[PDB]
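From the methods appendix. Each design record in this collection lists the tokenized structure first, followed by the designed amino acid sequence. Records were kept in a plain field format so they could be parsed without special tools. The example shown here is representative of the layout used throughout.

RECORD:
FOLD TOKENS (220 positions):
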């Protein structure tokens, strides 16, 4: 892994800042692929369920099903904090499109709700964690709004980075099991559409996010 500093330094070379998501989309995708290739970071995960399972919905225009900017770092920090307890990571296979970002990504939420329920069907003993970044945080919010209490009681923790709905709770869920990380100066957390540097640096919060999750996925 590069250090967090070398990673952020590469992001500052390749990521577009100050543009709207619409104008920046293709450069964001290309920039994330460049960083992923340079550092050997996977932008797609489809693991079987682990002892802990994370379902992660990526941000608008992110490549793959987890992107490079935040997801991979969160998964690495979580697995490190879990020790030998195996973490299975599943990306949420949705378009992460510009249009869905601007409309609210509701149907994607419904499909994620079915993805969640299907993990719980298949892996009744896993400790399930939901994660999101940017639009993916909207998808998690929408999934929770479309789910029943029994499903939601089976979710151990929710971590949202760069939440476009910042200030709204995760519906149907215990707020004490939710962590929302929105940087000061991230326009997306203000309901905006501009991609600024603070939107791109959530890898710095991976260790703190992992530490939030660990006590919520205990078997003791």
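DESIGN:
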């Amino acid at each position: 892994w590069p250090s967090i500093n070398e990673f952020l330094s590469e992001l500052a070379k390749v990521m577009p800042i100050g543009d709207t998501i619409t104008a920046a989309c293709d450069l964001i995708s290309d920039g994330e692929d460049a960083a992923a290739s340079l550092f050997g970071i996977s932008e797609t995960e489809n693991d079987p369920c682990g002892d802990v399972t994370v379902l992660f919905a990526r941000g608008t225009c992110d490549p793959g099903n987890v992107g490079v900017l935040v997801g991979p770092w969160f998964f690495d920090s979580l697995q490190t904090a879990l020790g030998s307890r195996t973490l299975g990571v599943k990306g949420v296979p949705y378009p992460a499109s510009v249009q869905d970002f601007l409309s609210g990504s509701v149907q994607n939420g419904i499909n994620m709700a079915n993805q969640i329920k299907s993990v719980l069907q298949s892996c009744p003993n896993t400790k399930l964690v939901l994660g999101g970044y940017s639009q993916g945080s909207m998808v998690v919010h929408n999934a929770a709004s479309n789910l029943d209490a029994a499903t939601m009681s089976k979710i151990s923790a929710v971590v949202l980075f760069g939440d476009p709905y910042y200030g709204k709770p995760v519906a149907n869920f215990d707020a004490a099991k939710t962590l929302v990380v929105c940087h000061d100066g991230d326009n997306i957390c203000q309901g905006g559409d501009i991609i600024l540097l603070p939107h791109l640096t959530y890898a710095e919060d991976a260790d703190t996010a992992a530490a939030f999750v660990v006590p919520l996925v205990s078997h003791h």
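APPENDIX NOTE: The longest strand covers residues 127-133.
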